[PDB]
Amino acid sequence: GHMEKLKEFRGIKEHLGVFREAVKDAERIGFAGVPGVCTPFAQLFAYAVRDKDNIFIPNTDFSKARKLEVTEYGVELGEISPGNVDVLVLLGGLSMPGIGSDIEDVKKLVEDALEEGGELMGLCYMDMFARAGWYELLDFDCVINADIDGYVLRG
Amino acid sequence: GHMEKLKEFRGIKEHLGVFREAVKDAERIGFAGVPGVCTPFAQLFAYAVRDKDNIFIPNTDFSKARKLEVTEYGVELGEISPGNVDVLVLLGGLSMPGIGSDIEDVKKLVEDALEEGGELMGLCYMDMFARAGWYELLDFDCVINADIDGYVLRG
Description:
The structure is a homodimer. Chain A has helices at residues 11-22, 39-48, 103-113, 128-131, 134-137, and strands at residues 4-10, 28-33, 53-58, 66-71, 74-80, 85-91, 114-125, 142-154.
């Protein structure tokens, strides 16, 4: 349903910080997204909340979820771990045409992987979820959206 | 040395695209950055050039470099592989005080890990390298810099 702007942020430090604030009371976070494109975002935000027990769900396949574990290299994928979560974070790639996932497979994921009473979140770039119609199709509790722009310089 | 602005980009697809362009003639790419916060950027951009032979170097420790390999989950760390590279991409976290790495250590890494005649690149956010004085301290061939801003919304 209707999503109201809470606040703005700037830079990577604040991007991680508003996520930490959003999940402050959570024990177990699940990040669901498209392998390759979205996996790095799951690893980045899991790192920011590495105190929690975190998992990565590929596409909408909860049975293939793996632990997001801290190593000397950062966050890496660990063993299969289809435990439900008290915050489920959908990544923007899921909403992409062609395999993002269909809305009914997404709703089944929410039914299966999010514990009853848990929070549904989205983390995306360039307003992907709003643009896909997903604010009307899903009941997000919180969405964090970032925009990216930049420059290439040569020596 | 002096870095001249070449072009601007917007969004994730274009961010990946300018990187693909910058390394189009490369065969093996090394990404060096701080584990945890920078590893995901190495994985993201490696995915974007998954046709190449790519490695992740933790901090400035070449001997601990690992292959960046594509799996059904995205890019994951594989075996130790301290082979030099024809493009070395320093990640912005390396320039952060406190372990970002000392500049002598970074110069050593460029000498050990970058092939003679290879290209030295920077990939950072929020203009980290310029702000740390690294355009004066290092001779980058290309730097790709992105800024992030966004919003939090609630349901």
